[PDB]
């Protein structure tokens, strides 16, 4: 499973001294899962190349756990290298056009599922079998606000 970093869906935190990360509890106090996530560190993998285990927790991975109960399989997630969702372009001005970023790994023998905020579109739907959508969404604009009078 390959998952891109995102704000509301996949949190990422460094582990503790023992190797894993300490378990915490919410307002309800119910345990929150802390599946091991082996992603690269730093901001960009350009200059450095380090792979360090972390634990990632949030919303979508729970769907992975719940789904894995009915379909009995194991998993080992790891974050993508480039860190971008990805599209298609031309390289070396040749007739070959390939994908870069998160999209590419599913294309050539490095994963079998994608669980991430991947938007449906005509181009990507050309050759990939998307299942039913599980969260209707959209795209909007946000701007700064202005302080009112005293």
């Amino acid at each position: 499973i390959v998952t891109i970093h995102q704000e509301p869906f996949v949190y990422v935190k460094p582990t503790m001294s023992d190797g894993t990360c300490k378990e915490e509890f919410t307002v309800n106090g119910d345990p929150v899962k802390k599946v091991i996530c082996t992603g690269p560190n730093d901001t960009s993998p350009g200059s450095p190349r380090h792979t360090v285990p972390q634990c990632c927790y949030g919303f979508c991975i729970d769907l992975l756990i719940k789904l894995a109960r009915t379909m009995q399989f194991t998993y080992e997630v790891h974050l993508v290298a480039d860190g971008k969702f990805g599209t298609q372009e031309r390289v070396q001005n040749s007739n070959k056009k390939e994908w870069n970023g998160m999209m590419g790994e599913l294309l050539s023998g490095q994963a079998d599922m994608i669980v991430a905020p991947l938007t449906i579109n005509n181009e990507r739907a050309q050759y990939i079998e998307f299942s039913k959508p599980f969260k209707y969404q959209g795209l909007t604009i946000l701007v700064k606000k202005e302080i009112p009078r005293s």
Binding site: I120, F130, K132, P133, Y136
Partner: protein, 147 residues
């Protein structure tokens, strides 16, 4: 037929078919149970939203079509392993295409298949708007609670 998606309207009294921006759909009705009628058919014209999207898709990919309504009830459900409505009409390999107002659920995915949805919807609550306002503690709310 449904209010926002498939509106039915009678034909023009002069020509025989109604105006443009629609497709002719012909429906079936039979006489009383005591004496029945031989293929008694009446044609009307259907227009709306799903009709327009179907026309667009037909112009996009070349194939023809002809629309005919249904009479055996409503949307449809499972009773004693049998199906009515659009699901019933398509389960017997006699329709090959169902359009209009079809929801999506668990059972129906086992008989027919489905494409990508285009309108978000679901179950909602609709109530009359109460005439009046809300102010349980109006007289104390403004000003301040410490002065």
């Amino acid at each position: 037929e449904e209010a926002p998606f498939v509106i039915v309207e009678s034909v023009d009294p002069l020509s025989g078919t109604c105006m443009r921006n629609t497709v002719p759909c012909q429906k079936r009705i039979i006489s009383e149970n005591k004496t029945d009628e031989e293929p008694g058919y009446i044609k009307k014209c259907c227009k709306g939203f799903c009709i327009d999207i179907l026309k667009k898709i037909s112009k996009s990919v070349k194939f023809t079509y002809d629309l005919y309504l249904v009479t055996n009830g409503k949307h449809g459900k499972k009773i004693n392993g049998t199906w009515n409505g659009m699901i019933g009409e398509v389960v017997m390999k006699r329709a090959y295409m169902a359009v209009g107002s079809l929801t999506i659920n668990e059972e129906r995915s086992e008989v027919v298949d489905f494409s990508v949805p285009f309108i978000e919807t679901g179950i909602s609550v609709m109530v009359s708007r109460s005439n009046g306002t809300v102010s349980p503690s109006a007289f104390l709310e403004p000003f301040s609670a410490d002065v």
